[PDB]
Amino acid sequence: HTPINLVRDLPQGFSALEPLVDLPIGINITRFQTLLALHRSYLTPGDS
Amino acid sequence: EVQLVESGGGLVQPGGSLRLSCAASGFTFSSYWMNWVRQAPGKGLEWVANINQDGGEKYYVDSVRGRFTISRDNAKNSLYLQMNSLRAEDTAVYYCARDPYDLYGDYGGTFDYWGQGTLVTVSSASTKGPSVFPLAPSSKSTSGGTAALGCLVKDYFPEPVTVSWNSGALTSGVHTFPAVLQSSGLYSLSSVVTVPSSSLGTQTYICNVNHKPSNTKVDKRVEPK
Amino acid sequence: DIQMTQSPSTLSASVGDRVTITCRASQSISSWLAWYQQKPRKAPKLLIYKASTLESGVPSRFSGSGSGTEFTLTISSLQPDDFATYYCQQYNSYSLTFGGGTKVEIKRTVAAPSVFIFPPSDEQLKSGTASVVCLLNNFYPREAKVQWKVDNALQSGNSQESVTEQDSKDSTYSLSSTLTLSKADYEKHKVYACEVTHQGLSSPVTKSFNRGE
Numbered sequence: 001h002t003p004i005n006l007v008r009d010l011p012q013g014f015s016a017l018e019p020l021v022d023l024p025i026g027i028n029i030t031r032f033q034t035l036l037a038l039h040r041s042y043l044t045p046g047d048s
Numbered sequence: 049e050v051q052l053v054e055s056g057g058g059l060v061q062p063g064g065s066l067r068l069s070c071a072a073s074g075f076t077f078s079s080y081w082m083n084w085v086r087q088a089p090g091k092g093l094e095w096v097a098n099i100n101q102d103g104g105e106k107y108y109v110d111s112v113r114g115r116f117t118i119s120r121d122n123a124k125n126s127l128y129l130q131m132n133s134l135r136a137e138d139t140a141v142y143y144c145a146r147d148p149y150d151l152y153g154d155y156g157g158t159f160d161y162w163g164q165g166t167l168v169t170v171s172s173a174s175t176k177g178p179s180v181f182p183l184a185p186s187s188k189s190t191s192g193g194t195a196a197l198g199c200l201v202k203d204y205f206p207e208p209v210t211v212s213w214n215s216g217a218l219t220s221g222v223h224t225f226p227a228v229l230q231s232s233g234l235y236s237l238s239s240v241v242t243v244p245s246s247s248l249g250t251q252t253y254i255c256n257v258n259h260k261p262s263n264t265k266v267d268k269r270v271e272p273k
Numbered sequence: 274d275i276q277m278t279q280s281p282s283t284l285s286a287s288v289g290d291r292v293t294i295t296c297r298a299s300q301s302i303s304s305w306l307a308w309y310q311q312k313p314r315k316a317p318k319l320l321i322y323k324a325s326t327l328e329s330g331v332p333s334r335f336s337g338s339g340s341g342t343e344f345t346l347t348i349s350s351l352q353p354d355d356f357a358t359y360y361c362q363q364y365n366s367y368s369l370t371f372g373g374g375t376k377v378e379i380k381r382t383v384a385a386p387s388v389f390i391f392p393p394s395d396e397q398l399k400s401g402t403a404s405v406v407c408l409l410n411n412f413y414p415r416e417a418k419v420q421w422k423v424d425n426a427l428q429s430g431n432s433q434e435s436v437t438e439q440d441s442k443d444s445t446y447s448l449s450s451t452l453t454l455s456k457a458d459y460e461k462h463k464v465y466a467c468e469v470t471h472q473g474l475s476s477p478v479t480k481s482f483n484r485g486e
Contacts, residue, residue: 005274007366008153012300041104083369085317093309093317093360095369109368143316148364156364157322158307165316183391183406186482196389196408200397223410223447225435230453237435238449240408242387 050074052144052163059169059206059261060134067130068166070144078122083147083159084129088140097129098147111137134170141165169206173233177262178204180255182270183238191245197270198240199255203232210258211239218253248272275299277306277361279372285380285414292348294375296361301342305365308337308346311374312357313438320359321346353379356439378415381444385473386412390466390480393459403459405452407467407480411445418470419450424462428452459484 002015040046056068070082083098097108097118106118115134120127127144145159183198201209211224224239239255249272257266276299286292296306306324309317319328321337324344334355337346348355356379361372386409393403409417415436421428434450450467466481 005367007275007300008150009303009366011366039104043103087311092374093311093371095371098369107367145316148322150364154303154305154365155323156305156307157326157328158309158319158362158364159317160319160328162316162318179397179400181394181397181404184394186391187389188480194387196387196410198391198408200394200404200406202397202404223437225437225447225449228433228435228451230433236404236433236451238406238408238451240389240410240447240449242410 050146050161052146052161054142054144054163054166057142057166057168059171059173059175061172062134062136062170064134064170065130065132066134066168067128068142068168069129070127070163072125072127072144072146075146077120077125081147081149082118082120082127083145084118084127084142085145085159086140086142087165088137094140096142099127131168134168136170139168139170141167167207171206171233173205175261176203176205176234177264178202178209178257178259178266180257180266180268182255182268183240184270185245185248185272187245193245194242195245195248196240196242197253198238199257199268199270200236200238201257202236203234204236204259204262205234206261207235208260209235209237210256210260211237212256212258213239213241214252214254215256274368275302275363275366275370277363277370277372279359279361279375281375282373283376283378285378286351287380288352289350292351292355292377293345294347294359294377295343295345296372298342298344298363302363302365304339306339306344306361306363308335309360309362309371310357311360317360351377351379353444355379378439379444381413383473384411384413384445386410386417386448386469386471386478388467388469388478388480390482392465392482392484398456398459401456403454403456405454405465405467407450407452407469409448409450409469409471411440411443411447412471412473413445414472415446416472417446417448419448420468420470421450421452422464422466422468424464425466
């Protein structure tokens with residue numbers, strides 16, 4: 001995790017990643033999806 | 049006519065707050081991001097703040113972050129910028145411009161439409177009407193040559209000031225210099241015009257000074273010694 | 274963040290010539306650059322978007338190209354209308370940033386300034402201060418030097434100068450210099466002189482006056 005105020009796209013620069021955890025799922029996993037979050041504010045009625 | 053009119057500029061002391069507003073017309077206001085950009089005279093143009101079409105997402109430059117809040121009323125077709133803890137540095141002309149969608153990304157078009165601007169001045173000085181002194185024609189040359197005359201508008205705050213000659217009757221050869229902020233913190237400027245030496249005496253030259261903030265109006269006749 | 278640096282900061286070209294202003298980003302913006310034209314006191318107008326797309330209603334004389342980090346706005350045939358400051362901006366990433374701005378000016382033949390000197394009005398003296406004004410009228414190029422002499426003594430820190438925008442018709446510039454002094458100081462000395470040096474002048478022009486006379 002790094003703070004950035006850079007490119008909307010990934011900024012040019014070098015950073016390294018470190019291992020957090022190991023989970024033995026053991027699944028033949030073909031695909032993935034990203035879950036996004038919604039935000040409703042004061043202003044918004046929460047309507048979907 | 050896509051238009052954006054800004055209102056709310058003025059003189060403000062440090063620590064004060066103002067809210068400028070920009071009324072938009074000519075397009076579907078609700079569908080576009082609106083931004084506020086400022087041009088501080090010595091410095092350049094700077095991007096102050098942006099709001100998403102939905103009105104939720106809001107971004108600001110670091111300098112302004114606690115101080116300024118941008119908001120909008122779509123039904124109102126108005127955009128606002130409330131400022132707080134004004135500093136002398138915030139003095140600038142603020143323009144409301146219609147921005148492009150960030151989503152476009154690598155193909156961003158930039159700000160298509162811009163308003164005229166609202167001038168906000170942050171200074172401790174109070175409003176004060178100008179003194180107008182004549183700059184009488186002095187030349188060490190034969191007559192028939194050209195002569196220069198003008199008015200010295202001094203010690204007024206804040207900008208702007210309006211200068212006309214003969215009620216707009218005399219345009220040519222007129223130079224009204226940009227005002228300079230003096231050490232006092234007050235503004236001073238001079239307006240000059242070049243005329244034929246023959247015209248002195250025959251022609252009346254009246255400098256019209258109008259300073260709206262002070263609500264003062266002055267008509268000074270410039271005559272030769 | 275990204276910094277955009279334009280060059281040159283200022284340029285002067287003759288009508289019809291081709292002008293090329295460049296802008297250099299600190300890092301790759303990609304295509305995310307636009308250009309704006311700004312006239313004195315007026316709000317900026319968008320010339321180009323996505324580095325090379327002409328905004329609607331903008332004159333065809335203007336064009337913009339770019340690749341990598343470096344981008345250029347060219348004006349194929351300079352016109353008098355073109356006088357202005359031009360800015361590049363990168364929308365690529367936040368925060369949005371504008372370049373310093375390039376002021377373009379119409380190059381014309383050199384012109385010497387007419388010089389006038391104005392003594393303080395009697396009315397002004399009643400206040401505390403005396404303001405001596407020296408007008409430099411309709412000269413080109415913009416660079417002009419003004420020195421102030423009170424009984425042939427050089428002056429420093431008591432002067433302020435202002436310059437007008439390039440003239441619509443003339444394409445010339447004008448300048449005012451004001452020397453401010455106390456009433457007491459003013460009464461002290463006899464001769465007030467304004468010395469001017471300019472490209473246009475073969476010899477220095479000095480206009481002066483005597484205090485009582």
